[PDB]
Amino acid sequence: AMASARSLRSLQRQRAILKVMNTIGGVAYLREQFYESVSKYMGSTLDKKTVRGDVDLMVESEKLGARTEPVSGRKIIFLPTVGEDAIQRYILKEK
């Protein structure tokens, strides 16, 4: 039985993920650097399970796109409208 405050915190974390994704250019590997950015945006990653949960909620509701980058095996998340050029540029840059 989820208390309303907890649900509100989930929404706050989703807003943070969204704002950070816009700020960092709309494409990110799901890894420590990203979670650290979300933590710093919110004012401060010993947990991370909690934020990952909300990333997952966002992927499932299609607020974020997600896919495995096959060469590295890392998971990429992206703003759905960012464009494949940007995604590939990011993959190339972080190669």
Author numbering: 543 to 586, 589 to 639
From the paper:
Recruitment of Pol III to these genes requires the essential transcription factors TFIIIB and TFIIIC2. The six subunits of yeast TFIIIC are partitioned into two DNA-binding subcomplexes (τA and τB). The binding of these intragenic promoters by TFIIIC permits the assembly of TFIIIB, upstream of the transcription start site, which subsequently leads to the recruitment of Pol III, the formation of a PIC and finally to transcription. A genetic study suggests that the two largest TFIIIC subunits, τ138 and τ131, are responsible for connecting τA and τB16.
The τ138 subunit is currently the least well-characterized subunit of TFIIIC. We first solved the structure of the central domain of τ138 (546–641) using the sulphur-SAD technique. The 1.4 Å crystal structure (Rwork/Rfree of 17.5%/19.8%) of this domain reveals a canonical winged helix domain that contains an additional C-terminal helix. This first structurally characterized part of τ138 thus represents an ‘extended' winged helix (eWH) domain35. The eWH domain is moderately well conserved from yeast to human, and contains basic patches that could also suggest a role in binding nucleic acids. However, we only detect very weak unspecific binding of the eWH domain to single and double-stranded DNA. Isothermal titration calorimetry (ITC) did not detect an interaction between the eWH and the TPR array. However, when we tested a construct that contained the eWH domain with additional residues at the C terminus (546–693), we observed a Kd for the interaction with the TPR array of ∼100 nM. We thus concluded that the region 641–693 of τ138, hereafter referred to as ‘τ131-Interaction Region (τIR)', is necessary and sufficient to bind the TPR array of τ131. Interestingly, the removal of just the eWH domain is also lethal to yeast, indicating that despite it being dispensable for the interaction with τ131 in vitro, it is still essential for proper TFIIIC function in vivo.
